[model samples]
Target chain A: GMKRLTYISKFSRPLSGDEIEAIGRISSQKNQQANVTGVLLCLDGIFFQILEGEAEKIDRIYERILADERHTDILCLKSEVEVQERMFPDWSMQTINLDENTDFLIRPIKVLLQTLTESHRILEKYTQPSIFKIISQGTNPLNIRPKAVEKIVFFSDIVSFSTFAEKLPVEEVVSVVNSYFSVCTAIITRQGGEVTKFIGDCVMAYFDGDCADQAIQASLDILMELEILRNSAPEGSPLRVLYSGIGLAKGKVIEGNIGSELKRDYTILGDAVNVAARLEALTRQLSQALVFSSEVKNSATKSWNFIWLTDSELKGKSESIDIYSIDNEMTRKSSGLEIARNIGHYLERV
Target chain B: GMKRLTYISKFSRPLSGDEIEAIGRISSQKNQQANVTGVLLCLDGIFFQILEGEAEKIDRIYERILADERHTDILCLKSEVEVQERMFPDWSMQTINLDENTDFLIRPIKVLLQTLTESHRILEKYTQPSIFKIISQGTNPLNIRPKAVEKIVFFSDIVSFSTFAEKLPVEEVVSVVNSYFSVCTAIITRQGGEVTKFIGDCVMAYFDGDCADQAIQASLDILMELEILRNSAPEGSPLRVLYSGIGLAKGKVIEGNIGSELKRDYTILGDAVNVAARLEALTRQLSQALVFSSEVKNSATKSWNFIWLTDSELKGKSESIDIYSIDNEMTRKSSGLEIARNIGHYLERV
Candidate 1:
């Protein structure tokens, strides 16, 4: 037979003597009759702890808990037939104002406790279900619109996709499409950037300028990935000999709320979002892998391996635009690019 | 129907040589059809960009994107269509690296077409709708938690309300109750804390211990606020001298899985919790309005006002326990104690 052994619970937050006294008083009153265990937890503003025992005992204690204001936001993190694990059994109520994480432990006891705490986090993941799982595995605390002085939005799309989609399954189209979107999402997200959206084959996203210079770098990364796919994939692979247009420029894109009630979303919406889209359309005709508008290079003016190209009038614009082909990486010190291009162009023509 | 736009989106991370050629070729081709916008936001490990335009054009562009590799987890935050706002639109294609927010204009008239780029956070509650709103709403890019950090939980409740509820009607009760909880939640969260749930008669919350002492202090601040309420409410008003019994101790309590399986509520639990309730229970009985267990006292031991009372035997403890209570200004001064801060068997959590 399983013995319902519930230990005494303490506060999760730091406790004063009186708080412990009150716990002692209430437990004794109920302990005389039942087997119950409880603990209290209070931290800067977060209070976490648990109680375990026979359903009846817990209910009785909970009734009394209703009397005191401290027992608010009662949560059921874990519990089973036997005590799963106890972090503060010895404390009768020992409070490590700070959880025993980090390199803050002195006694082996704290180290032991820290391990227990880490296991507790693991335990937490297993015991209860997490909702955010649907979106992504781990959602970290971040600044969606962190305070910064400037930013640049990058937009791009494929030259011709009418000939491409005939192969994907309709049922799995969203899934397959998400596959591409996921790649961008994962890369940008990992680097602290977000994918604003995917317009068919087109994608739009932005990065703040204040943290570290990422806009130009992000564009470069996307371009390089495409080239890698073209080079690595088998001749018959869908990704082989693929090309996409891209546009980049320097301007303001405030992190603001876009969309209406039924579909509220966050994004950087301004002139930048559109220009990037239009520029991507020019890729097929130019047959260039990475192109830069004069405005972007002029403002950032960072050193890049690019050759000045001819300028032409962009549709809808009243003036001609200066263009450049990001030819090669001066950092690479290799001439393999020319060969790779010849092979890829021939494959595309085939 | 909304027309989806497709364009090359730049990432914050730089591209390898292969990427430049691939995108350059694509952009050149797209130049004959739809204009494209592009940017690159490269951070430590993230890349972001945005491009918008014709639905079918975007479809073609997506095919090439599907084949590209090197990036991962690309999330399309927004891709629906309604209105268009492009900040940069001179070149058929443009590319940029976003390190932070970029502002480009006043140099241009009527904002013809331009693209902006950034790498810093662009979404937060304080900076919602527009960057201009940040100042109008008397806020800064202080908290960008609105998007990235989902509100796991926000709590509100009354303290010792059973007695109060018996006297007031539901409407008035809700009004007055909301007022107090509002004060507590707003003040605490204003400094970066979260309200987890509302106890029947009290509010429960959680504050991570790393950098959240403001929350604990904020809880205690509620007591001071009660003092103001005690003075401000009408003479015959039901709002009695509000005294709060706070019991907080630092420990572990699960978050993100609070709601029940049937309902899915997020809540916290642990030992420190039991003691918090006990502290509140002991409040009305004690001469001091506030009482805490050693755990709570220890959290604030370094820099909070408190006084230790003789050992008290709580209901459930095996032996007599040390008790502590808050010492108001007059009480500490009149008692002629050495100093309120060090009035304990103090130890720096060694």
Candidate 2:
């Protein structure tokens, strides 16, 4: 698996000298259109053409045609079509060079590959899905890794920012929030937690196993940095300095990208994630300014004065959750969390 | 390959029962602050938290989080990663309990059971693309092939149409032409050609192999349909329809609904695409009559005639193409094309 770009093939059947050169020249001409490339897709009847030019241009040229020279009544196929950007580098308007490399060749990696095995007559040609996996030298890299992604999930929110949207411009509200998320993303990605997705004010992330703690700490840096951002904004912009909670959990968990057959996404899935999210929510409900779930606590038995929040009726459970909380005591083991104790007082009155 | 809706999931190892409930509630929460969905990416120990949701809500939640508890800090990996609907649903997400057959499970699948060996080292769970083909059970008999590119959008226009824009308010010209092309695309897509993109006058299209006639005589219908449209427009506002050659070809097009990465597109792609386009520009120098490329003419021979248009050099095309005019003879011996044939007369002139 590697970076994906585009795929185009030369005609499967022998083409006259003219057709071959045409394909080559066109391919060379369209060298930089979004890494555009293509190949001949002919099988039985035969389709001869180039897949080249700008991604959009090549797509435009391709979607409006059908190869029915004698049968002019057949439907036209495409003028432009959305296609995957394969890892290959050459951009051409001709069929892709299939199996060009034994080292890099891939079975077609698309989700629906079964259709290729099924006969169209048994079902219907156009009506049938192209379920067969395509075998080629290019496709997306495999994202299923058992390395258990390391993640630093941080949740942030404007304390009094709710309903303010009805008053402020929607764009302004978005700008303010986006500004904060950008701040968090910049900090974490810089330090290295792959920011996967953001929910209402919550950030989900994956940290490399070796540097899980670094990711956790970076989330804190971002949370504290927001004050400077809010202060720098033009006065009255409603870019309020916000606060956030960070839930850190690390362990062996399925941590590559996951998605449906048609759609593949980079993500992490496993019970570890459940713990991280649960911890962030517990922080919000505890009214203790910050809370980390049991997962975070388990990893910290080495030394940390972690307190227990009142066992509350947790969501998705028949039993109450013995939620835990940890704050930096006067002890110098962890820095700045002592500052959290001070900020912890700010939310009490608000 | 079927209509794949964007699916969202957030992974945070929720440590407590409250966290679990919070995670589940996030998807459908009104609080917006507490609930959000997106990938929870954790990499290299840095918790890069990516949260995606209504702008305000995501921001609000992020703001209020204070990482004073067990959680350290967080990062945002991809606050706005895309989500593709599941090809095979993990029943746990939607079903409370699984039965031999449940609404969640689209049974009769050729599922490839994957198991990993216990290991302490980094594990790459990449599957052979062929495995996807070997495993996926064509559960739902939608008559749609998985790999088949269906529902491609087709768009084209006389690039020279820009001239008219200068004659009138850019708005007026755009409105008129856009209105015209809109109908043109509608007619084509109605017959299954997808209208992908339109820049200025250049409209993009896709002929879904699955559709009745991906290469149907949509272009001709579009031209003829405009006559009524022009006559009905307000006086002096009517615009003359322009002529331009159409190109087309087919195979392996990615024809599925497409939108943002967050949304799946209905489109198609492949080399036949280049052939389709070869016909488009090849007809540009023709006597302004509707024409099809040699390949297209062969398929619709009974309904269309190869009114030989002199060979011409197409832009980006190396070989001279013998384009054919849409025969429109309508002397077909098939039962299916009768309805379309009745209307073929209007398609003769521009």
Candidate 3:
């Protein structure tokens, strides 16, 4: 069984660039001879690395490395595990160049370390049954980059959800929220949209489709499904009264990984993302179940019934927007963008 | 020139204890043949292990382990490093029994991960000058346990410092706050108090000095320092009017590591903590610069000049407290329990 060992040690002081590079080259030669594979990272003179190989070979190499005159204060036994494959199967000894991928790799070790420590504390306190399972798999941490991507962003939330959550028993409120998200999230996936975040009782999602029709369709389908959920529920369920307002906006969004090497989140940014959120917030004031910005309506290849909701100034914008709520009459026209022309007229005026 | 790798792979499904032990036995046989040393942790059907050996030898064993039938989706390359000593130098292919040391070993990995991740985020965003140094060396995570320790708990904050922080330019406010904390925090450490949490402009600290004299002295010294600071500051500086209220209490506190597996903090807890905080809060109402509870007075080995401030209803308590303010005469008495006795006489009447 191949063993994995992770250790972090500190340099007595700082290392020159030549020292770091020489250490890498020497390590690569020796590690390759021994079939050891792992990357070394030096940040502000602290050395962190993970090594993999045969148990005794690794131990032998470890002691020799420890005795090297360069560094001291070794922190060993950080993590030793038997993994199915070598994470660095192709590498003998590599110095991490701090590329996106290398950063991505280092980021999660910190996150996982944080997670485990947190979990350990909680588990110790309640002696809660050690709940362990596959949390995430096959996701690359270093691949996060911020770039503009064409997406129809949707933001929606249950009306009065916070009030309900605050006043009612948590168990009951959670049941109601989960029931709502389960149906809505499933519909979103089925419609080929990705649920980006569940903001409390709100569902934020994005569709990378070329047009906004899919988002509009998903919005309508969600309302239709919600009606069915309400009808199917037993008497006095909170679902009966729960209503949602969804807003869709299509534009280029800055999406990428934004965070430090330690704590990072893959998320979307830019004004378009904010506009979608603002539109969702406006649903209550406009008394509309669904609201779509002029950009969303303009990009649609198909025609849906839409009414000019009104012109209103949104926060963070210098000018007002021509907000449109989806017309309840589901007169589905696959390609009527003269409706786009009419909305375009209002857009031009605004 | 040895590389170490620590990796954890989740079992697609749960594994039985017998299967785990059998897997461990098989791993030992293969690893011993390859001269590998490491331990396998069977946590809720998850197999976590660290491997050490030669690069080639580790790769050879890693492949065979990947082919093992019991586990699926191996995530290798979590960490790879070259270290001087083997964490499990004495053990070869051992199954980790969840002992205290083992748990302790596992806990720091998470804390380190958390600390690094948090630090990385802060450093990266500010792109601040890379300030890296040995923050922690050779600290074990899992050894934290709750134990009662006699400590002098002290809590103090600048009066209405938030408005100052908000209204003034950030740099100016930060400078003032830092100046205050620098003097205050220095005094605290000089007097053998460990400044625990700095809540905004508030400083919370503890001293396991077995008496309250140090806390009393520190509080008095802080007032004197503030005066010197005000006199020495630039003309019309904000430091001119700054005053703080300090509360001191002495008692046994439950101090240990608290937080989830991902995040952990070594801190103190129990009612003594809350009472200290409450006493600090009471300073504003009592209009006193210093207040020590009866317990603190009872524990003091030195005679300190103090006056009975007043009896007031403290929140979350049925009875009022005999709050006292330090007398400014700067009188020194090593045996002040008689002074406490005179105060105790007032306590009896109340």
Candidate 4:
């Protein structure tokens, strides 16, 4: 069985940055040899760390730490004897320095840690490796460079979400919302699209130019998966009405961080973002589950049984643009069942 | 001048949680007596800490830490002789436990610390007191409770942003967008409104039930500020065309955490959000800088000289809703100058 251990302590004296790096290097090597995986963070003259491995291995390392003279006031915050998976399976002893540069990201974590003394369960939920990876990627919310790039912008929202939310309990509504997002995220990520923002029940994502075909396929997959959710629900349930409206547009967009100093969001902005959103809004009016622009149709590398819906005036556009959708019957029925099975798998995990 | 010192170390031996708590309490008391403010974190037999105070006070504490035998492997990551502000001004040795619960937040900080070895400048930008305070609020992004509440939702976006973005450099576009956000954030905060999400050039915000008057005033303030921005720009500058369309709606919204486990966003959703967005979109067509629904008109606690624009069919609504806008001439001229001065002040700081 696997075990995990977490603790905190203080340094006896301050050493140079080089010495700290050397120590981290040595510990990582040792941990690797011991098949131990965890992360170490250093800040403000303190050392905080999490260790995971076989129970005996962690216990042995902890014993050595007990005799180490450089540390003071050590406290074990938690110890789990039976861990199902390793949060840092790839890292032996990842090291981090919490300095002034990362103070913004560190402050919130510190606050949560202080409040979590009695409610450690909350911290456990965010312990996944993926979450850690995102934070470390230095998506420094404070300073981001803006860039212009071509992408396939996607917009989607639950059909009649307001009606469903109005009729369902808050918790039930949240469940349905999460289920919808789970399916969309899975399909989008699998198809190489990056899910960007979630506004209410709406999702905004983008794909590289080469991934247009995949983006279209992902959209259809989402519609079919939503249909499965609708059919799987019992009669009279709000989930029975589960459906989505999707809009796709291809164009050049400015990608960067935008907001006041208090809060910054990394997002894409351009005519395409607006066009895609407007097209999604139009889906309800057009009575179509999926809608897209001519840009997307022209950019797609593979041919699809696309149906030209109409030529309509989009908000803010000077001239009318062509709109298109795919025949619902053309969406492979077998893939729908596969998506249904995938949703079930996802729901069970959540 | 204030100074900051940060370091990490290991404990000589593991201690119980109560013992750790007692140590934290004693250190806090000592630090307070010394007029020093900082934060301390403990995890996996390691101690990470940051201290801020007069140089003499911090130096005295560091000396004490050197004599503290319970600590070892002490390494200093950063030391600043001068600091403009204390990142943790209200805390005297605020202690945190980084256990499994906070692994998600910790992982990214760790990754950033590793990559930032050569570029510590990036980390320095986020080291603000407010950023730390927000983080310490335990907005455990993973476990936010959903709530049903009545809110006055406001939406605003730059008029013809796409044209400006296309014509200007990416950096200039970001500056204009950020300037727009700064002005809105300042006025909105003054009027007791919470700016929620920023979608491209669009800003979404909400106010409590009693603050409808404040929300409306904030909208007008934003308009005036934008007008000042347009006037301040030199002729032929893309910023000279700066203007925004505003929309307001009042209704019950579901506020909670939305998104996949990979990413979660705390936001509000409901018919009001949609209605507010649609009204903003209609502003260009209606030739109004500001627009609101009858819901907002009916719920105001203060009287205003408002004009009934027209009854229009909004997207997702079954029937047409009455729309209204404030007379632009009614906006105070003096406040526009004050806003211009404030924007100058803000730009200088940035």
RMSD of each: 35.2, 33.2, 22.1, 14.4
| lDDT, residue B324, candidate 2 | 54
Residue-wise C-alpha lDDT for candidate 1, range B135-224, written one tens digit per residue: 222232222222112121212223334333334444444445545655666666665765543333345556655433554566567667
For model 1 the local lDDT of residue A318 reads 60
Better of 2 and 3 by TM-score: 3
- Whole-model Cα lDDT per candidate? 0.41, 0.38, 0.57, 0.67
* Candidate 3 fraction of reference contacts recovered: 0.01
Positional deviation of A327 in candidate 1, in angstroms? Answer: 1.5
Q: What is the lDDT of residue A253 in candidate 1?
A: 38
Q: Can you write out model 3's per-residue Cα lDDT over A176-274, one digit (the tens) per residue?
A: 655666667777767877665443345667888475888888888988887778677676566665667788876444433333222223443333223
Q: How far is A62's C-alpha from truth in model 3 (Å)?
A: 27
What candidate 4 gets wrong by more than 4 Å, as runs, is A1-143, A234-236, A271-277, A328-350, B1-143, B234-236, B271-277, B328-350
After superposition, candidate 3 runs with Cα above 4 Å error: A1-350, B1-141, B271-277, B313-315, B329-350
Chain A TM-score, cand. 1: 0.48
User: Which candidate has the highest lDDT of all?
Assistant: 4
Across all candidates, the chain A TM-score values are: 0.48, 0.46, 0.53, 0.58
TM-score-sorted candidate list, best first: 4, 3, 1, 2
lDDT of 2 by residue, A293-321 (tens): 45555544245556776665322235565
